[PDB]
Each structure stands twice: as structure tokens, then as C-alpha cells.
């Protein structure tokens, strides 16, 4: 039932909607979702490609923008920034009710900047200023350049959603960059209490990559095991004395955010990923259909930290089989960037 979203909040996890469109906001649906337990919104280039293609309310906006001397990218940005600012306004009461801990809307920078740290910083600062809302996060892929950019953006006071994480090692590198940016601001006497960062760690794409060649006792288990080990890493990193010294001064922990949590294999229950990854101080962003499956027949239980020993044993067998999860993670991040660039080019063509 609908109350499950509140039950999950009580277990310490926010549930965000992994979709955004002009009609979602204009219809009043997003506002009703925020009253019913949804706590935020994520977008990406694929989400916008599907929204622009299918939502009737973009037609008049595109016709208006084609009357202006603007690049396809600027037409896209005008549309997307407007959707994000409208969604931010819907989510602002929630955001302010928790002291700025919830109610975020994420907008991703152009995929072509993913390996350009300076260009990423410049675009992120610009989009942050263009949206002009305290509850907007700029979404940046967790490449090496993206972790460079994260440190700078954190030091600039900008909230960031670091995405396309598939690696525990890369995630730990992101925490260290965050901490360096927080330390910089504290040394300069600047505020840190409103800076929020999430680390979007992808789930289904790990199982999609491996399951066809895994032995039976591991099919459908690797992504959850990797996430459960990542959360143990998170507990260790943020409780250590080094970070505690920053949190004592007002720093917020980074939070893990489970992404790609729609089930893609019909052999698994449609709520598998949401049901399996509930723990305190985390986020799960879900597509519409998964949100409705979870409301209908999901289960609210603190599952993320259960049986961590078995998660470790499974990761040890994955390595025994010759699957290097760090090599896989790099490949999956690369593939995700190619897929996002393909979607971006597909949405730009009708805006020429």
C-alpha cells in the first residue's frame, strides 16, 4: 500500500522518482507524489529524450524556441532547465522541512564533458546558476575527471549527484574528493551545512552484464552483493575520526543512492532491488513502474545490512571465477556514457 513509502522513510531511506517531464509537473502529479512519500527526482539524457519525444506539452515550447537564434543544445537546456526549476519549486517545501536534506532534483551535464574536468566545472556552475534553486543537484559522471570536478564544485558550495558509479574503489575516491572540498571550505570559514552530495551506484546493469555466464547460485546476486559491500565501506569511511572531525563542524556525509533499480530480467521479482537495499542514510531512485510495483507488493525492511558475510563470500566467488568487478565497473561506466551520448544526440536532432 501507499504507506510503504513512509515506512521506508522510517528505516532511513528516501525514495526518489527516476523520471521528469513537463506534464509530470504541470499536471500536479509531482506535487501529489511529494505529499505521498516521494522525496526527490532524478533525470538523465535518456529520461529527457523519452520525455521530449512523448510529452505533448513540449510541442509549443519547441515551436517557440525554433523562432530564436539558438543552438540545439541551448534549446534542450532551456526546456530541461525549465522542467527542473518547476520541479524544484514543487519539491521546495519538502527540502526546507528537513533543513535541506531531501527534496532534490538532479540535472546532468552534457555527456561530451565527462573526461574534461574544467569544462564540467564550468557547465555545472552555469547550470547551477541557471536553475537558481537551492534544491537542485548537478549530476556529474564519476569518471576520474568527474571526481576532480566534484572536489572543485563542493568547494564552490554546489550540491552534486555523482553518477555512473559501479566500483567500490571509485566510490571511495569520490568520498575523499568530497572531504577535501569540505575541508577547503571549513579552512576558508565558509558554510558547509547545505552542501549535499549523493553517489549514484548502479544496480541492474551489473546483473545484466554477468548473469548469462554465471553459475546458478550467483545469478541475480552480484549487484546486490556489491551494493551491500559498498554500504559497509560507507559506514567505515564516514564514521572514521577523519570524517567525524568534519561532521562535527557541520559537514554532511555523502549518501549512497541506488540507481538502475528497475528489474530488467523477468526471471526476478520486480521489487527485488528496492526490497533488497533498504538501509539508513541512503536513497533509492526508481522508475515509475518500479515505484508502482513497490507500493503494490514491495516490503519495507532493513535489508541492506543483512547477511553482509554472504555478500562478501559471493564477491569472493565472483573473483574466483575470474570476473574483475573493477574492470567491469570501468566498462559499464564507459558503456553508460556512450548510451547517454546516443540518447542526447537523438533528442537534439528534432531541435535543429
Cβ atoms 264, 223 nearer than 8 A? no
Distance CA 153, CA 138 (A): 9
Per the entry, the structure determination technique was X-ray
**DSSP result, 192-222:** -TT--EEEEEE-HHHHHHHGGGS-GGGTTTH
Location of C-alpha cell 525554433: 66
**CATH class of this structure's domain 3-352:** alpha beta
Note the Cα 6 to chain centre separation in Å. 20
296: Cβ–Cβ under 8 A, 6 or more apart, which residues? none
CA proximity to 344, closest of 141, 137, 167: 141
Distance CA 289, CA 276 (A): 17
CA proximity to 221, closest of 325, 117, 141: 325
Burial of 129 from C-beta contacts in 10 A (0-12 / 13-18 / 19+): exposed
All three cell numbers of 8: 521506508
Distance CA 124, CA 161 (A): 11
Distance CA 104, CA 97 (A): 12
Note the Cα 46 to chain centre separation in Å. 14
Distance CA 104, CA 255 (A): 13
Active site residue 219: no
Cβ atoms 199, 231 nearer than 8 A? no
Length of the chain: 352
Distance CA 204, CA 163 (A): 14
Distance CA 110, CA 119 (A): 10
Q: How many CB atoms lie within 10 A of CB 206?
A: 22
Residue 14: beta bridge partners?
283
Distance CA 313, CA 309 (A): 6
Distance CA 207, CA 224 (A): 9
For 89, 169, 205, 246, 287, the CA distances from 221, given in Å and listed in that order, are 39, 20, 12, 35, 21
User: Where in the chain are the domains?
Assistant: 3-352
Cβ atoms 128, 138 nearer than 8 A? yes
172: Cβ–Cβ under 8 A, 6 or more apart, which residues? 233, 237
DSSP state at residue 283: E
> Any idea what the Cα angle at residue 27 is, between residues 64 and 65, rounded to 5°?
10
All three cell numbers of 70: 539558438
Query: Hey, is 139 helix, strand or coil?
Result: strand
Query: Hey, is 285 helix, strand or coil?
Result: strand
- Give me the resolution in angstroms, 1 decimal: 1.4
- The residue from 66, 134, 139, 184 that is catalytic is 139
Dihedral over Cα of 174, 178, 180, 181: its sign: positive
Amino acid at each position: 500500500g501507499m504507506t510503504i513509502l513512509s515506512d521506508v522513510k522510517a528505516l532511513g531511506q528516501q525514495i526518489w522518482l527516476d523520471n521528469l517531464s513537463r506534464s509530470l509537473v504541470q499536471s500536479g502529479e509531482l506535487a501529489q507524489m511529494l505529499k505521498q512519500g516521494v522525496c526527490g527526482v532524478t533525470s538523465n539524457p535518456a529520461i529527457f529524450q523519452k520525455a521530449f519525444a512523448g510529452d505533448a506539452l513540449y510541442a509549443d515550447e519547441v515551436a517557440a524556441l525554433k523562432r530564436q537564434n539558438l543552438s540545439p543544445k541551448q534549446r534542450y537546456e532551456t526546456m530541461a532547465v525549465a522542467d527542473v526549476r518547476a520541479a524544484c519549486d514543487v519539491c521546495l517545501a519538502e527540502h526546507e522541512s528537513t533543513g535541506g536534506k531531501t527534496g532534490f532534483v538532479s540535472l546532468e551535464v552534457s555527456p561530451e564533458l565527462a573526461k574534461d574536468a574544467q569544462g564540467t566545472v564550468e557547465e555545472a556552475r552555469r547550470l547551477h546558476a541557471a536553475i537558481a534553486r537551492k534544491n537542485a543537484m548537478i549530476k556529474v559522471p564519476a569518471t576520474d575527471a568527474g571526481i576532480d570536478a566534484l572536489e572543485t564544485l563542493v568547494s564552490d558550495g554546489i550540491s552534486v549527484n555523482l553518477t555512473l558509479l559501479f566500483s567500490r574503489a571509485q566510490t571511495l575516491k569520490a568520498y575523499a574528493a568530497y572531504a577535501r572540498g569540505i575541508a577547503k571550505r571549513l579552512a576558508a570559514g565558509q558554510s558547509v551545512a547545505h552542501i549535499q552530495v549523493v553517489a549514484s551506484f548502479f544496480i541492474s546493469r551489473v546483473d545484466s552484464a554477468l548473469d548469462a555466464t554465471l553459475p546458478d547460485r550467483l545469478k541475480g546476486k552480484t549487484a546486490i552483493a556489491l551494493a551491500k559491500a559498498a554500504y559497509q565501506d560507507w559506514e567505515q569511511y564516514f564514521t572514521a575520526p577523519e570524517f567525524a572531525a568534519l561532521e562535527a563542524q557541520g559537514a554532511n556525509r555523502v549518501q549512497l543512492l541506488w540507481a538502475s533499480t528497475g528489474v530488467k530480467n523477468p526471471a526476478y521479482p520486480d521489487t527485488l532491488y528496492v526490497d533488497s537495499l533498504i538501509g539508513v542514510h541512503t536513497v533509492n531512485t526508481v522508475p515509475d513502474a518500479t515505484l508502482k510495483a513497490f507500493i503494490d507488493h514491495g516490503t519495507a525492511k532493513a535489508t541492506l545490512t543483512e547477511s553482509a558475510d554472504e555478500a562478501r563470500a559471493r564477491l569472493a566467488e565472483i573473483a574466483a571465477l575470474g570476473i574483475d568487478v573493477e574492470t567491469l565497473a570501468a566498462r559499464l561506466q564507459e558503456d553508460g556514457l556512450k548510451q547517454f551520448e546516443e540518447a542526447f544526440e537523438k533528442l537534439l536532432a528534432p531541435l535543429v
